[PDB]
């Protein structure tokens, strides 16, 4: 099937079982997924929550978000948005496309996301999250975080970098969306470049006059989407 065994974005495979090839009679469809080349699977997302540790969380859940991992589906991440009464970042992982509830292993990322903060503030929930072909972006209640990368496993634990947004407090990050074009880049042609847009609902304060930013592939420089009554950018 495959002769290369690095870490890269490789598509899934569609499997057809038949009783004969040319005279196709009893067709049955299915999926086959590679494990050793999938980017996201090689890292540990965080501390594993056990059973009956997620059951008490249920009367606190407020909304559900999912990812898709554009090149190969069925390896989605499911994120919980929760009430401000409870605390923690709660993400489950699938590898079989949510066919059984027993397989969605639940993690928690509170330690990793509190590391680059210098102090715990109040309590945080995941607002939105996307999974690009080589990066993971999470807009949580306390700001925006970008994973370092997925193709170079070094510590078996995701290292998040906190994006900077001057003048942005908690009541802005709870109203903000991430937009991304779901396109698969399997063999990685040179012209293919990925973008991510973030949009807030703000008042155009003194510190920042924009409400809409976008960034290229290593999500480090976030530049405003509008340059030099005034309309609002719903989506760029």
């Amino acid at each position: 099937i495959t002769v290369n065994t690095d870490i890269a974005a490789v598509e899934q495979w569609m499997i057809k079982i038949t009783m004969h090839e040319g005279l196709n009679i009893y067709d049955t469809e299915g999926t086959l997924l590679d494990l050793v080349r999938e980017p996201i699977l090689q890292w540990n997302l965080g501390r594993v929550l056990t059973e009956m540790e997620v059951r008490d969380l249920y009367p606190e859940v407020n909304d559900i978000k999912v990812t898709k991992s554009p090149c190969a589906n069925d390896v989605a991440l499911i994120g919980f948005m929760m009430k401000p009464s409870s605390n923690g970042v709660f993400i489950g992982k699938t590898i079989s496309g949510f066919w059984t509830y027993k397989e969605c292993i639940w993690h928690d990322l509170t330690e990793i996301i509190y590391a680059e903060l210098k102090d715990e503030h109040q309590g945080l929930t995941v607002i939105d999250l996307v999974l690009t072909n080589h990066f993971l972006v999470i807009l949580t209640s306390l700001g925006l975080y970008v994973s370092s990368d997925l193709r170079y496993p070094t510590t078996s634990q995701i290292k998040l970098s906190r994006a900077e947004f001057c003048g942005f407090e908690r009541v802005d990050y709870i109203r903000g969306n991430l937009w991304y074009n779901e396109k698969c880049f399997a063999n990685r042609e040179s012209f293919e470049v990925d973008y991510v847009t973030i949009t807030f609902n703000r008042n155009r304060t003194l510190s920042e006059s924009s409400s809409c930013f976008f960034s290229k592939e290593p999500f480090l420089h976030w530049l405003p989407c509008v340059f030099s009554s005034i309309p609002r950018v719903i989506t760029f």
Binding site: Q12, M14, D27, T28, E29, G30, T31, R55, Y58, V61, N62, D63, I64, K65, V66, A72, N73, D74, A76, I78, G97, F98, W99, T100, Y101, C104, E182
Partner: protein, 97 residues
């Protein structure tokens, strides 16, 4: 991206569906759960995701049917008086009163 299916969720619990590039749509049904979301896998099957509920559908076909979770295909008709009227051998008008 398989089967080119698109599904919108609208408050009051309704679910609208279409294919990509078509200029018409349909109403798959209704769903009144408090917190839920819809997911499409690689083969095209649709799953309802809820805390402690990952449902896939009662009736499953070989291909990726997108209406398995809902019970019966709903009646799209309203409540009015229809007056029918012939115009040809195989064509007919209906007036809503």
């Amino acid at each position: 991206f398989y089967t080119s299916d698109i599904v919108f969720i609208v408050e009051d619990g309704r679910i609208l569906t279409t294919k990509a590039g078509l200029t018409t749509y349909s109403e798959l049904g209704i769903l009144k759960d408090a917190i839920f979301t819809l997911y499409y896998d690689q083969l095209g099957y649709i799953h309802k995701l809820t805390p402690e509920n990952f449902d896939a559908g009662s009736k499953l076909l070989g291909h990726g049917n997108s209406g398995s979770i809902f019970g019966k295909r709903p009646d799209l008709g309203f409540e009015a008086i229809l007056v029918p009227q012939y115009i040809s051998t195989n064509e007919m008008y209906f007036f809503a009163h």
